[PDB]
A paper describes a structure:
We subsequently prepared cryo-EM grids using our anaerobic setup. As many as 180,868 particles were used to calculate the final 3D reconstruction at an estimated resolution of 2.90 Å by applying the gold standard FSC criterion. Calculation of the local resolution indicates that the protein core, which represents about 83% of the volume of the reconstruction, is at a resolution between 2.75 Å and 3.05 Å, while the most exposed loops at the surface are at lower resolution ranging from 3.05 to 3.55 Å. The most significant difference corresponds to a rotation of 1.6° between monomers when compared to the D. africanus PFOR crystal structures and up to 2.6° when compared to the enzyme from Moorella thermoacetica. The largest disordered region corresponds to the first 14 residues of domain VII (residues 1170–1183), which consists of a domain-swapping extension. In addition, the Cys1195-Cys1212 disulfide bridge, the Ca2+ and Mg2+ ions and the thiamine pyrophosphate (TPP), essential for the protein activity, are clearly visible in the cryo-EM reconstruction. More to the point, the three [Fe4S4] clusters are also perfectly defined in each monomer with high matching density (up to about 15 σ). The four iron and four sulfide atoms are observed in all clusters, and all of the metal ions are bound to their expected cysteine ligands. Only one of the cysteine ligands of the distal [Fe4S4] cluster displays an alternative conformation never seen in the published X-ray structures. The cryo-EM refined model is very similar to previously published PFOR crystal structures, especially for several PFOR features ([Fe4S4] clusters, TPP, disulfide bridges, Ca2+). The only notable difference is an opening of the dimer interface in the latter, which is most likely due to crystal packing.
PFOR is a metalloprotein found in several anaerobic microorganisms where it is responsible for the reversible ferredoxin-dependent oxidative decarboxylation of pyruvate. PFOR is a 267 kDa homodimer that contains three [Fe4S4] clusters per monomer. We have used our previous experience with cryo-crystallography to develop a method to prepare cryo-EM grids in an anaerobic chamber and have applied it to solve the structures of apoferritin and the 3 [Fe4S4]-containing pyruvate ferredoxin oxidoreductase (PFOR) at 2.40 Å and 2.90 Å resolution, respectively. [Fe-S] clusters are often sensitive to oxygen-induced degradation, leading to activity loss of the coordinating metalloprotein.
Residue numbers in the entry:
A (entry chain B): 2 to 247
B (entry chain A): 2 to 554, 558 to 574, 579 to 590, 598 to 625, 636 to 714, 720 to 899, 903 to 1104, 1111 to 1169, ...
C (entry chain B): 1184 to 1230
D (entry chain B): 864 to 899, 903 to 1048
E (entry chain B): 309 to 370
Write the structure that this text describes.
Amino acid sequence: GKKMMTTDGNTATAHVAYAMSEVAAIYPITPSSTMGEEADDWAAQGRKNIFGQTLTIREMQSEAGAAGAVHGALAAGALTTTFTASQGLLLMIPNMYKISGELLPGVFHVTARAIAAHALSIFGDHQDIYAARQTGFAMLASSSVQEAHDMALVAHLAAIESNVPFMHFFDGFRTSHEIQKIEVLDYADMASLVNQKALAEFRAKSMNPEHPHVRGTAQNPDIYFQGREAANPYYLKVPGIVAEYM
Amino acid sequence: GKKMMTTDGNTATAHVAYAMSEVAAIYPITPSSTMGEEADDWAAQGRKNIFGQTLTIREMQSEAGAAGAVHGALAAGALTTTFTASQGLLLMIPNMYKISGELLPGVFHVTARAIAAHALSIFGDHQDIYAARQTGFAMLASSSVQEAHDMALVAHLAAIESNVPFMHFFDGFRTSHEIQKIEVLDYADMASLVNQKALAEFRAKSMNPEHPHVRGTAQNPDIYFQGREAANPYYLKVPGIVAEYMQKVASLTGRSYKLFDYVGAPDAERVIVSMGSSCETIEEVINHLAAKGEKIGLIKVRLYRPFVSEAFFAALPASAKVITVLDRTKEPGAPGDPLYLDVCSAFVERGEAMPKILAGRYGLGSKEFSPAMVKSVYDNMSGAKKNHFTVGIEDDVTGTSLPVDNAFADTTPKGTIQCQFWGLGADGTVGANKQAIKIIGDNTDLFAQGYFSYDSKKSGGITISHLRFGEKPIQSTYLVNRADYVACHNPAYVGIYDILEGIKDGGTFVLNSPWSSLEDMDKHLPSGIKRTIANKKLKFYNIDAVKIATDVGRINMIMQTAFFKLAGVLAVDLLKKSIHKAIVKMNTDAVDQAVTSLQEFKYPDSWKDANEFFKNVVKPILTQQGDKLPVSAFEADGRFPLGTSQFEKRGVAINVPQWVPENCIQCNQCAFVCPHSAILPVLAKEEELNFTALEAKGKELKGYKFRIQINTLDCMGCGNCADICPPKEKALVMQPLDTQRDAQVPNLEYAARIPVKSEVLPRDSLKGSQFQEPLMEFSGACSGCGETPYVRVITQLFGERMFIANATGCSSIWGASAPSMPYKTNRLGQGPAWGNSLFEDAAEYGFGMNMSMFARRTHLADLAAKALESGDVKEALQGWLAGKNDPIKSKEYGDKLKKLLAGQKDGLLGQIAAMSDLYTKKSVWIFGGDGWAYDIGYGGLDHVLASGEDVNVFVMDTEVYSNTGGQSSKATPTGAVAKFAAAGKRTGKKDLARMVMTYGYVYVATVSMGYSKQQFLKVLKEAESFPGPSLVIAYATCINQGLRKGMGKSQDVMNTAVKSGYWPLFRYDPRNPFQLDSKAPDGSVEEFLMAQNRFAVLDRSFPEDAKRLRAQVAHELDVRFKELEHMAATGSVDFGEGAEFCTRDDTPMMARPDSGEACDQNRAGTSEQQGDLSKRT
Amino acid sequence: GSVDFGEGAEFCTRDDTPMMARPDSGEACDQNRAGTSEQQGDLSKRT
Amino acid sequence: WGNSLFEDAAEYGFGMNMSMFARRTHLADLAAKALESGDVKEALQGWLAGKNDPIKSKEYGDKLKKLLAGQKDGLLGQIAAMSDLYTKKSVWIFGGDGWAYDIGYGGLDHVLASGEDVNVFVMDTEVYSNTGGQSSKATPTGAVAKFAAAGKRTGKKDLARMVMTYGYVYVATVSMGYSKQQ
Amino acid sequence: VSEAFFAALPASAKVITVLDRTKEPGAPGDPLYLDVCSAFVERGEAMPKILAGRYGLGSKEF
Ligand SMILES: Cc1ncc(C[n+]2csc(CCOP(=O)(O)OP(=O)(O)O)c2C)c(N)n1
Ligand SMILES: Cc1ncc(C[n+]2csc(CCOP(=O)(O)OP(=O)(O)O)c2C)c(N)n1
Ligand code: SF4
Ligand code: SF4
Ligand code: SF4
Ligand SMILES: [Ca+2]
Ligand SMILES: [Mg+2]
Ligand SMILES: [Mg+2]
């Protein structure tokens, strides 16, 4: 379904994320505000995701709020994405721990931006993405605009299948805003790549009063270690999923 | 200036931090709240730092606020410290980046606590500290209490000198709370260690208008790299500073530390590299194995960041061939845990011979790390080496566990006494044991270690205490497992738990038991315990201490006497004098009668010859034996099933109520009121049925028998029901449990099978609502908790279609503490969908639920609209589509659709039948306390509650941080005594309701159940009915409020709270939108305040302050209600298109692909002025 | 000045959970498990 | 001038307030210890009594900085060491609609309910002016912004009326184009 | 995944520089350098020279 368009990394990534998501909670932060703004633009116009619905976009009071709303939408059984940059990612980490702890299949699209240490900065480096290795997200990187499109698609598919949340990151103000002529896939072509069995399973295990479960308990020295060590198979399976979807 | 005191890690660290700081901004978080609380205590008393001033302590709304306040105090030139734990540290990291970026010399004291991944946890591991390596802090670690004191001192001195902020961390609930006898330095001695030149320089370079500078700029690709790379010298200098200050402190105390320390055989081949309290236990194990010729050792890491390979290799013996790097963290998918990566990088950068390096996980969530596990780690090194293992748990999902032999003999050094004290909560066992440790420490030359295991259950929980008293210093940093002396303070446990699993051969076993006879012990002592006592030749001492205490007119003193005469550590004179220091005659008589009463029991020799989920996991977890549970038992995502509290059956109340059927007026208020749902209104038919039932009254209750069944085993004995029972001759009378359980347990077992009649009466009504099944039953809340009845009524109205976003607080501690889940599924199986995200983001979690449900039901609507194009299915689909916003119509037509579309798995119809759980409209609820709604999760709550989406938030306003030790909130009202309000809080209650009411599109209503139950019910119904945001704040009572008559008066107290005008009731309905449901104040505010222990203490301390504060409270509630009466009496397009001027700058923060079209930049003047300039020229 | 809202109260102002543990805490106290003070007096009188 | 972060400017300013409070109390204790030449005693008493007034504190701080020139010994040397703490300081918190309204709101509310002498000035542009003009809570009803492309449906966040519920906070709304004297 | 990393890495490679766009004060190395070093330690085979370099901080030109 390859069609050529001339866009930057924000547009290339937001195209695929709009296709592959139904819920998006976004806080504005440079250089990632473009993806959320154009997603809200397309939602207002009426663009349809792979499931044939307009993507539901909401704006939070913070990026902590964006990560929390992402957690709620993933827990309730909706495909969720968010767009992030540095200070946003720092505010997002503690909820990313919960998102990977519950094995919820979200995709964060992060534009690499400096962390304010001696001075605030909006430009690109990998400090924010490296600050989030421990959270348990899978982390995918894109070198160019074409690779941003391809890797955003791979991240969404592998997040659906693997039940491990993904962070997709491309360089800020070096890929986010560099116009380039790239071929993108038609939404019909990327729709056929979804693992329908995994999508149905993901909707089944989600929070719902008809089949209720308790998520978010408080545990004591006795059983916390086992609940930590019981999520290893999903991580042993995610890399093969990423390779196969590549 | 060394003085000996017996304290835990919190006290040892807060001592030094108080000396070395002048400003401290603190948020409460377990296990670090103690340091801040005692710092505020000393500030209120008047303790002086090294500079001779009381330390200025403030409390923030969050730990982000604590880190920001720390930044401001460091920037303005004050020595600043803060105390942190896991979630706090995660919220602190982004400001820690700024603090290290500006080279500001702060010290954070972090207690290591788990990060909530699959479940919240308050216990110890290094996940939070490892999450903060990148921030640029220097990171110092302390193995024991003495090392916590020393390392806190070193951290403050090196932070002052090096201009690099420091993080000091010690293990949480393993060093934070383990009492030990340590020598501390006098403040005069630690004052002389400060580098005065560096302190003066630090004050000079700080933010001040007299010598102003710009800090916090915004830089561009051109110069940011250099400003990053210009801070390298300070980090190249900090490690030498830390080493030199270790030397300077060691000169004073006599204990020498290095950046990396080595303990063990110099010619050792198997070396563990560790960090934290485990370094103690391993050392102890080494001191065992070294006596058997073992060539093993240990490297203890003190300075984690910056990592200095020079020190590491100076510690590492060159004969070492295999190294295991033990880490208390899990990073999913990382090539290794952080310390392993650091050691590997050190060996790669050296380039010399590279020994074998192994990585292992241990002690996650303060999981035990015992000598046997250390031995197994060394054995793994010795042969059949395994990389990336876990030690301590039985892994069976990925095979990453070492085998552990649990027959490792006593490694604790000879000369030590081990004591286990099992007790029932608040029977005074831990208080008596702390007194014992303090007495022995102050009066002898023995080191006294004491650890206190607790329980998740607030009322009636078990409390285990492990005490060691040794001539040599106590390095055993783990729970006792082979005890010299066991003491059971509650005979109820003798069947419920294994009291003698930690006994030794001949170990004295002292049992509290009324049955002090040969035959009665034969009848009551379980065969297993009898066989143990007979076989291993114990010294069994049985005493009935309750009779002794009742005679002398609290079993604390008899038990302490039993310890002081039977432990062997010493005693009689010491305990007598200690009682004298603290009526007196009764205590000494109890001491002497206990002295006479203790005698060995001549046991019989024949004594040596004598759902499914619950049965598998929950019963073993409850009996404190889930350490044997493998990893196959636990869900990968950490979810737990509902309805686990139902099989608890814990009869811990002393007094349970009895129903007197003759007086009952069948009002259903004792059920509406009960906090643990031990009251079951059984409404039956005559053909359906000791089980005395009445004739139910009213037209709806025509042929029904009525009964009020008491859940005798699941009763907490709070007396709320009996105190609320209307008839002046009480239909409910509190009677001893032993005289009412035997005839009431079978009655409830029978009554559990009567169908619940939920259609006879509406659920909006009091009696009818109580005629519906409660979906939140048997919490772990405190007996008489003022929060559980509200949530139980909410689930009785909405439990079938409900999402709960539960903030962190008591709501989450009793709503889910593994393995007990009060929430349960109804007969159809549709329970509440309960989830806890974090403390600060419950609101955003619930809002996200709302968005997900909105999206999926719109997708369902689109599918149904596509399926409109058999006639019955068309009618069902149209009926659902029209009325999907009504829960009743949506439920009806969803049932219709689920009947019609059975097995439909093809096409649009198959798709529509696929999501059958989205038919009936769902009610997402947000449950949290005063702290969440008021302090930390406030911004998210405000945003979700101003967005306009149909979400409902219920506030359990206990006016305090009830869950965490009762610290001040913003709900904490004027003149209230709490933590961080020791003199009485001076700021008023946070007017959260009046804040939200300013929006005008939010339903706001305040409720109190003790006052009126009908207003609460109407409020719930019209809150879930409002198509928009809805906020409801419920006055709730907590045991921290110190009700002087008891928690049974909760409702009464609740009632009084609304009569006096302290807690008005009102409803703001946007659909005069405001209205007052509450009457004018009665003027009885002083009685209500004096009724609660906080104001009683405030009076006992400062009467003039207390009376002024109470006057201001009365005046402010008068004017607040005066204000209430004053106001109750009466498509896509962009904003930048087609504008003459630019709506966008040219900065990169405002760049988009559409932008860039030429436009007028307001640089040639206004349009009118431009026209004038054109006209004139 | 310093004083704690838990001193000199007939009932416990603290649970036994680890989230509410301090070195001062642990003194024996009534846990609201035998009923209210008035109801306790009534039970004592009747028996 | 200092910028901390977007969400924590309020806590940064509050921390400034605490640091200044602590250091000036330490100065007060030093001066009270130095009370026990007569001109220095009069200067110190005059500053101690009127350290809460910026004008009197400035006057007597100038007096003290004249008297204690080069004094580098004892209590007097210590008192002369911190000559930048004489005149009472005014800590200000400057931020826009987004900070005061959306993200730094909790910290602002806490510092502005604590009761300590801090002053916060809101440059309410009704929008996230810095970042592309996205919707705020100050963004009023029927306004077109980013994430309000069809016109915002929720009203302005009544921040002033929220804070005024405390009753111990000075709240005042200003507009310079309307009147400069107010 | 060290399997993929070593499948990419040519066996004739003798010197590796791991470029990172981050600064961690006091860390033994930046995160990607530590990952590659751990991969080579866990392989146990010949260990080429591994160098670490910083570049492009704050969208600095590279
Ligand atoms: C960010 C963060 N800081 C601190 C804590 C520790 N904590 C857990 S519950 C709680 C207090 C809960 O307050 P509130 O909402 O009033 O609840 P309740 O009093 O009903 O327990 C605190 C401070 C935490 N979990 N997360
Ligand atoms: C946590 C975080 N999220 C997002 C940003 C990006 N950001 C910088 S300024 C700004 C908006 C500022 O809003 P406001 O207070 O109204 O300021 P003004 O409109 O006057 O510029 C945003 C979103 C940030 N710096 N930090
Ligand atoms: S509260 Fe008393 S009168 Fe009312 S139903 Fe219960 S037992 Fe009967
Ligand atoms: S209200 Fe209290 S005393 Fe009555 S049944 Fe419930 S827990 Fe027991
Ligand atoms: S809110 Fe208070 S009474 Fe209720 S469980 Fe928590 S501490 Fe106990
Ligand atoms: Ca509603
Ligand atoms: Mg509370
Ligand atoms: Mg603005």
